[PDB]
Design an enzyme around this catalytic site. Sequence first.
Site, mmCIF file in Angstrom:
data_model
loop_
_atom_site.group_PDB
_atom_site.id
_atom_site.type_symbol
_atom_site.label_atom_id
_atom_site.label_comp_id
_atom_site.label_asym_id
_atom_site.label_seq_id
_atom_site.Cartn_x
_atom_site.Cartn_y
_atom_site.Cartn_z
ATOM 1 N N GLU A 1 -0.638 -18.847 0.008
ATOM 2 C CA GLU A 1 -1.845 -19.641 -0.206
ATOM 3 C C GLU A 1 -1.829 -20.271 -1.591
ATOM 4 O OE1 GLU A 1 -5.618 -17.882 0.647
ATOM 5 O OE2 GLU A 1 -4.849 -16.658 2.291
ATOM 6 N N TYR A 2 -1.314 -21.490 -1.769
ATOM 7 C CA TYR A 2 -0.620 -22.312 -0.782
ATOM 8 C C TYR A 2 0.418 -23.069 -1.598
ATOM 9 C CZ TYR A 2 -5.078 -21.672 1.617
ATOM 10 O OH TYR A 2 -6.203 -21.131 2.195
ATOM 11 N N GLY B 1 2.194 -12.224 1.667
ATOM 12 C CA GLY B 1 1.334 -13.064 0.854
ATOM 13 C C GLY B 1 -0.131 -12.696 0.956
ATOM 14 N N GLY B 2 -0.945 -13.657 1.373
ATOM 15 C CA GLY B 2 -2.375 -13.458 1.432
ATOM 16 C C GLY B 2 -3.074 -14.062 0.233
ATOM 17 N N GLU C 1 0.830 -1.203 0.000
ATOM 18 C CA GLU C 1 0.000 0.000 0.000
ATOM 19 C C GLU C 1 0.863 1.252 0.000
ATOM 20 O OE1 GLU C 1 -3.291 0.362 -0.358
ATOM 21 O OE2 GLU C 1 -3.622 -1.808 -0.452
HETATM 22 C C1 95K Z 1 -11.297 -14.600 0.520
HETATM 23 C C2 95K Z 1 -11.531 -15.166 1.902
HETATM 24 C C3 95K Z 1 -11.913 -16.646 1.807
HETATM 25 C C4 95K Z 1 -10.273 -15.065 2.775
HETATM 26 N N1 95K Z 1 -10.388 -15.369 4.177
HETATM 27 C C5 95K Z 1 -11.400 -14.449 4.777
HETATM 28 C C6 95K Z 1 -11.015 -12.944 4.696
HETATM 29 C C7 95K Z 1 -12.160 -12.002 4.978
HETATM 30 C C8 95K Z 1 -12.749 -11.994 6.243
HETATM 31 C C9 95K Z 1 -13.796 -11.140 6.501
HETATM 32 C C10 95K Z 1 -14.247 -10.278 5.457
HETATM 33 BR BR1 95K Z 1 -15.722 -9.098 5.867
HETATM 34 C C11 95K Z 1 -13.674 -10.285 4.185
HETATM 35 C C12 95K Z 1 -12.618 -11.145 3.930
HETATM 36 C C13 95K Z 1 -9.059 -15.185 4.818
HETATM 37 C C14 95K Z 1 -9.132 -15.334 6.294
HETATM 38 C C15 95K Z 1 -7.785 -15.028 6.908
HETATM 39 N N2 95K Z 1 -6.764 -15.883 6.327
HETATM 40 C C16 95K Z 1 -5.537 -15.801 6.968
HETATM 41 N N3 95K Z 1 -4.370 -15.530 6.392
HETATM 42 N N4 95K Z 1 -3.438 -15.557 7.341
HETATM 43 C C17 95K Z 1 -4.032 -15.843 8.503
HETATM 44 N N5 95K Z 1 -3.401 -15.990 9.788
HETATM 45 N N6 95K Z 1 -5.361 -16.002 8.300
HETATM 46 C C18 95K Z 1 -6.708 -15.868 4.876
HETATM 47 C C19 95K Z 1 -8.057 -16.129 4.257
#
Ligand code: 95K
Length: 377
Positions: free
Chosen positions: A119-120, A76-77, A49
């Site tokens: 991922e992943y 990442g993400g 950003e």
């Molecule tokens: C696209 C979606 C399935 C991704 N998922 C949920 C992210 C999210 C949560 C709440 C809202 Br509102 C909008 C988007 C993420 C949760 C967090 N996650 C994560 N990445 N790293 C950690 N420790 N957790 C990655 C996927």
Amino acid sequence: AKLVCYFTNWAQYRQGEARFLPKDLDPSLCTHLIYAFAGMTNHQLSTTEWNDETLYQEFNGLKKMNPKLKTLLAIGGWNFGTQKFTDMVATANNRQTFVNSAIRFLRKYSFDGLDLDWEYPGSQGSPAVDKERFTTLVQDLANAFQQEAQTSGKERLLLSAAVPAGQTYVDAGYEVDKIAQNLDFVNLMAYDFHGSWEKVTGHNSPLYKRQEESGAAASLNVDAAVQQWLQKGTPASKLILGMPTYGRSFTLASSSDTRVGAPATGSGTPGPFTKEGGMLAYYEVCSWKGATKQRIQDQKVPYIFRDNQWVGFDDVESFKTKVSYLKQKGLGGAMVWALDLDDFAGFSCNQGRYPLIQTLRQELSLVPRGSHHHHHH
Ligand SMILES: CC(C)CN(CCc1ccc(Br)cc1)C1CCN(c2nnc(N)[nH]2)CC1
């Protein structure tokens, strides 16, 4: 115990009371704060950003107020893709380029460690060889962090990883016993178990299976995910249980069938602040007017429905249950996605600031003894 909390660098763009900046961060809420997300440019750690550098100063500046606090930067993400990771881990030269860049970057910006959020490896387009190459990357980072601590005399940079709960992803990408030895802790993403990509309602983050479930579906729950990571070789003390301060929503095929497992036609209506169909922040579900809240008895978590909308989410009670669970299993603590999705400003839920994350802190016995302004739930 650890309480590992994620900050997101796009929450600053939400409107009104939902806008979140480092100012809204409480320096003593969590033990570890992880900044999501950094990226990669020419195999080197980079910002994502336009104002990350400003935010890094505010974020790591929290340690002035709470010197015990540790910060990490997550790379990442889910929108990052896999190709940059694949290309970086493909050769020793590229891994060295990355590792050295990470050390310099973290030291420059005053982070205490790196969190890996690929991922992943081995999935989503990443080739099978990335499973072993991820292991090598983790080893390279751990070894280089150890060496830098030695040569510099500074406190060793921490290394963590955010890892999936689903067996398909785990087996395709993660040599669990090997990486666990080199990671300081393992952030288990014990959520996104079900969601609107599926044709029936299901909970984002159920603790246990439903009696009706069978086959692979019967492992899509927190307990199975935790046991999976433990049995595959993660020391319990290193396993940090993820907790979602969000829910996942569905549009029901019929308002007359609101069961778990009821037919769904797609994502729920987007929330007014998060604006992403299929997901809702806790603050978008906690005060839903004219809705009916229910609990899934087998799974120890709530859902709520109104007309043709159905949302599975976590509340204070389910967080208490999950902390009781993690303590029974001897886990290293809880991790939370994410700070900005809890009712961080207390504007919605009538439960004070950070009701869900304060519940985690309280149940983990992490409330500072000199704390004045906390709120028990
Ligand atoms: C696209 C979606 C399935 C991704 N998922 C949920 C992210 C999210 C949560 C709440 C809202 Br509102 C909008 C988007 C993420 C949760 C967090 N996650 C994560 N990445 N790293 C950690 N420790 N957790 C990655 C996927």
